[PDB]
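Minutes, project check-in

Agenda point 3 was the complex the collaborators sent over. CS summarized: two entities, 146 residues total, and the question is how they sit relative to each other. Sequences were read into the notes so everyone works from the same version.
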Amino acid sequence: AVVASELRCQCLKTLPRVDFKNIQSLSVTPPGPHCAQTEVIATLKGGQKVCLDPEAPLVQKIIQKILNKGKAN
Amino acid sequence: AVVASELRCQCLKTLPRVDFKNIQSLSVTPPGPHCAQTEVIATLKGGQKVCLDPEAPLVQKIIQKILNKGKAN
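CS then shared the predicted structure for the full assembly.
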C-alpha cells in the first residue's frame, strides 16, 4: 500500500564497507533527480548484494584494497 | 555454432577508460576460473555499457576522478 521507494536514492541506505571480504562484486553509478548523491552496489560472497557508500570515499582506502586485491595475476 | 564465450573472463575485452564523461554506471567484480584477473563493467550516457580495465589501476586516477565527480552535494 504505502510507498517506500520513490524520489529517494539508489537504495534506502548504503554501507561504507559491506561484508568486505565477502564483497564479490561492485556497481558504482551517479545520483539522479532524488539520490542527490553518487551511490554504489556491492555483492557479497554467498549470495547477498546491496548498495554501498557513495564511491566509498571515506572507505575508499579499504575499497582500493578490495580493488587492488586482484594482485594475483 | 562455434563458441566465443567460455573459460575467458568477464568480457571478450575491456577498456581502460570507456566513454568516461559518458560512464553513467560502473560494476567491479573479481575474476573466476578463467578471467584470471579482476574485471569491471561501466555504462555510458545514452545507453551503451561494457567491461572496463581491471579496477582501472592505470586508469584509477581518471577513475577516482569519476568517483569523486559527485562533489555536488
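Noted in discussion: The two ends of chain A are 51 Å apart (CA to CA).
Follow-up: revisit at the next meeting once the mutant set is ready.
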